[PDB]
Amino acid sequence: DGYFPPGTSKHELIARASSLKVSEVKAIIKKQVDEHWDVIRDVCGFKNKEVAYAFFFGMATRESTFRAATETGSGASHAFGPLQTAETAYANANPNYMPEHNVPEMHQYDFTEYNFYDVGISVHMGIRHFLHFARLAKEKYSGRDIARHGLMGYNTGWIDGADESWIVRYADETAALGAWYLRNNHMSDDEFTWDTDPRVDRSNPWEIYY
Ligand SMILES: OC[C@H]1O[C@@H](O[C@H]2[C@H](O)[C@@H](O)[C@H](O[C@H]3[C@H](O)[C@@H](O)[C@H](O[C@@H]4[C@@H](CO)O[C@](O)(CO)[C@H]4O)O[C@@H]3CO)O[C@@H]2CO)[C@H](O)[C@@H](O)[C@@H]1O
Ligand SMILES: OC[C@H]1O[C@@H](O[C@H]2[C@H](O)[C@@H](O)[C@H](O[C@H]3[C@H](O)[C@@H](O)[C@H](O[C@H]4[C@H](O)[C@@H](O)[C@H](O)O[C@@H]4CO)O[C@@H]3CO)O[C@@H]2CO)[C@H](O)[C@@H](O)[C@@H]1O
Ligand SMILES: [Mn+2]
């Protein structure tokens, strides 16, 4: 899963992440979806792999605008990378973080500076972390609600925490942003959208995925 060379320093990992082209970040995401398609499909029920690429492009857009060196927050809210993978995704981080032992199909990397700051590990771990919350959601939700409430867990820690406005502005927006890439033939190029971009169709945004 590691992208940059083993032993690369924090500041080099960050500089190199900031230099990745949109196309390069899309390729990292696609590789991880390819590797982990069976568990992604099993949990989320996405139609096919292409729409799963688009969903995770939607997450990259919503969380970082594809700026892979984005870093935010403190403690449980401290996140890095294109998907804003928080410390809580990682094994052997703070012992008070809620455990994520419900995704045996994906390696859970330990919390280390390489594993948190390397783009490859960060993307793998963000997918794993999302699946952790989507599986919490699947206990009570079906169809689009698995990914919709799984996203709310990803961002807030709680699948049912959020008010409708934030479900719309975070989860529905993620779905809409991801679909932009598929609908406009931007699955491999350097083009990107962004939260609230008026180019994006954000009406019935879950449609393409199922
Ligand atoms: O009560 C049960 C236990 O709770 C533990 O605290 C939880 C807390 O309740 C959750 O809200 C918090 O959730 C994190 C979540 O894990 C992260 O994925 C998320 O990451 C965000 C990321 C992606 O959107 O980007 C940010 O927005 C950038 O800032 C991140 O915020 O952040 C959520 C909010 O912090 O997780 C903690 C830890 O599991 C207590 O620690 C326990 O003592 C308690 O038993
Ligand atoms: O809270 C969830 C998540 O948020 C992440 O931060 C997001 C912001 O939520 C989101 O609003 C923000 O969107 C910006 C984007 O950064 C800009 O690049 C983009 O700029 C547009 C501009 O609005 C247009 O006028 C111009 O023509 O084009 C540019 C694009 O080239 O504007 C949007 C909307 O304001 O993106 C943030 C991510 O980059 C946090 O990072 C994350 O931690 C949170 O979990
Ligand atoms: Mn992987």
Author numbering: 141 to 350
Q: What text comes from the article?
A:
RtGH124 is the defining member of CAZY family GH124. Unusually for R. thermocellum, RtGH124A is not targeted to the multi-enzyme cellulosome complex of the organism but instead consists of a ‘dockerin’ domain which instead targets the enzyme to the cell surface of the bacterium, followed by a CAZY GH124 catalytic domain; RtGh124 is therefore an unusual enzyme if its primary role is in cellulose degradation yet it is not part of the cellulose complex. Here, we show that the metal-ion site of GH124 can accommodate a variety of metal ions (but not Ca2+) and that the histidine is modified by a carbonyl group at C2 to make 2-oxohistidine (but only at a fraction of approximately 0.5). Metal binding also occurs with a stoichiometry of approximately 0.5 (in solution by ITC and in the crystal through occupancy refinement) and we are thus unable to deconvolute whether the 2-oxohistidine is required for metal binding or antithetical to it.
In passing, we determined a series of structures of GH124 co-crystallized with cellohexaose which revealed the unusual binding of a contaminant, a terminally fructosylated cellooligosaccharide, with unambiguous density at ∼1 Å resolution. Clear electron density indicated that the reducing-end sugar was not glucose, as expected, but a 1–4-linked fructose moiety. The hexasaccharide appears not to be cleaved, as four to six molecules of each chain have been observed in all of the structures (data not shown). Enzyme subsites −4 to −1 are occupied by one molecule and +1 to +4 by another, with both of them stabilized in the crystal by a second molecule in the same asymmetric unit. Our initial thought was that the fructosylated oligosaccharide would be likely to represent a very minor contaminant in the G6 preparation, one somehow selected by the enzyme owing to tighter binding and/or inhibitory potential. The originally purchased G6 sample contained an approximately 1:1 ratio of G6 and G5F (but subsequently purchased batches were 100% G6), highlighting that the unusual observed species was simply a contaminant in the commercial supply of G6 available at that time. Manganese is coordinated by Asp141, Gln172, Glu175, His176, His264 and a water molecule. High-resolution structures of RtGH124 (1.40–0.94 Å) have revealed an unambiguous modification of C2 of His264. In the case of manganese, the metal and the His264 modification both display partial occupancies of 0.7 and 0.3, respectively.
